[PDB]
Design a protein around this ligand. Structure first.
Ligand SMILES: OC[C@H]1O[C@@H](O)[C@H](O)[C@@H](O)[C@H]1O
Ligand SMILES: [Pt+2]
Length: 362
């Protein structure tokens, strides 16, 4: 999508993974405060995105969305002003259908232009567009309608498509938006997170500046996985140029949660100027190696132990894009230490944990 937005994957927060339909303006305002106070905003997490359940069940007499009078009494415009004053951006959610997936508010089908104009007037900076209640109309028709409305009335609004990988969006969504969900919903558990990563991985070649594969919102900090599993989750999402939308309650994070989300070296891989999605390059009995190119001839590498026991994983130069005769300085992103390497890197990796490195050629 050539709208000057999403030149790098979007970074922010989304209310769904932790709050689901139980969201309100107080939570959004406090979340904005938290992103700033915790230092996350400075690291790049700028989008404060509201998901489902923010509007009234019905539109007003003019056919416009109405912020939920119970949970968002102050309105979206006021909320956007609040967030903007904090140096952040505000995201909203709608659906390419008659109602959102929760069936608690309207969708924008046949109201695309009016809704985008409304969002723009409110100061909305991002739109996640779901796929429920399609009224028997095609994915391409419904999304094309909103794409057109956005390109004309919402030029400064990031466009996130959410149609769960139906019809292989990686092969066409880039001409319609800035990112597209490639899979069904992620859940806060190991099986879900790993399968989302695997499914998203097959579309690596289609990702690039302006159009990203979206393996869904981060579950880091929600309690369903271990610290090791979350470290791998964050590392892989970063390497895969996935959107980095925090999904936990950033107002009450543990130090462990903050440490994972706050690793600027890992974030830098996700935000790399080359904008290439890293992918799985080695997979031997659950011991995997994921890698991809970075700017200035560098490489990003993740050793991921998907087994239940401690194991040694070895990343071979030939599999990560380097000639065997290339000496480099390896940077362990989680240990925050540098060392010399050539030919390969071997390391003992903990169960479900990982090792992440950036290789800088000598
Ligand atoms: O109802 C809200 C819920 O709807 C689903 O369709 C999306 O995939 C989720 O990410 C979330 O937005
Ligand atoms: Pt299309």
């Amino acid at each position: 999508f050539e709208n000057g937005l999403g030149r790098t994957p979007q970074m922010g927060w989304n209310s769904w993974n932790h709050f689901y339909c139980g969201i309100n303006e107080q939570i959004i305002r406090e979340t904005a405060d938290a992103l700033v106070n915790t230092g996350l905003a400075k690291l790049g997490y700028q989008y404060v995105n509201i998901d489902d359940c923010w509007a009234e069940y019905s539109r007003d007499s003019q056919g416009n969305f109405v912020p939920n009078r119970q949970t968002f009494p102050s309105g979206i415009k006021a909320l956007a002003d609040y967030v903007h004053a904090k140096g952040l951006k505000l995201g909203i959610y709608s659906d390419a259908g008659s109602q959102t997936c929760s069936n608690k508010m309207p969708g924008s089908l046949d109201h695309e232009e009016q809704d985008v104009k409304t969002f723009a007037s409110w100061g909305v900076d991002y739109l996640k567009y779901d796929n429920c209640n399609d009224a028997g109309r095609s994915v391409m028709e419904r999304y094309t309608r909103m794409s057109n409305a956005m390109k004309t009335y919402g030029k400064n609004i990031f466009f996130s498509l959410c149609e769960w990988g139906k019809e292989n969006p990686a092969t066409w969504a880039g001409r319609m938006g800035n990112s597209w969900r490639t899979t069904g919903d992620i859940a806060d558990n190991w099986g879900s997170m790993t399968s989302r990563a695997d499914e998203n991985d097959q579309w690596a070649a289609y990702a690039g500046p302006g159009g990203w594969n979206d393996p869904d919102m981060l579950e880091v900090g929600n309690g369903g996985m271990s610290e090791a599993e979350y470290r791998s989750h964050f590392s892989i999402w970063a390497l895969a140029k996935a959107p980095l939308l925090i999904g936990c309650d950033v107002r009450s994070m543990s130090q462990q949660t903050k440490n994972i989300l706050s690793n600027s070296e890992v974030i830098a891989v996700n935000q790399d100027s080359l904008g290439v999605q890293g992918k799985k390059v080695q997979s031997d009995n659950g011991l995997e190696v994921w890698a991809g190119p970075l700017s200035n001839n560098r490489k990003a590498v993740v050793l991921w132990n998907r087994q239940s026991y401690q194991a040694t994983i070895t990343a071979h130069w030939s599999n990560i894009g380097l000639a065997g005769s290339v000496a480099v300085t390896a940077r362990d992103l989680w240990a925050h230490s540098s060392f010399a390497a050539q030919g390969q890197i071997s390391a003992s990796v903990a169960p479900h944990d990982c090792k992440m490195y950036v290789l800088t050629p000598n």
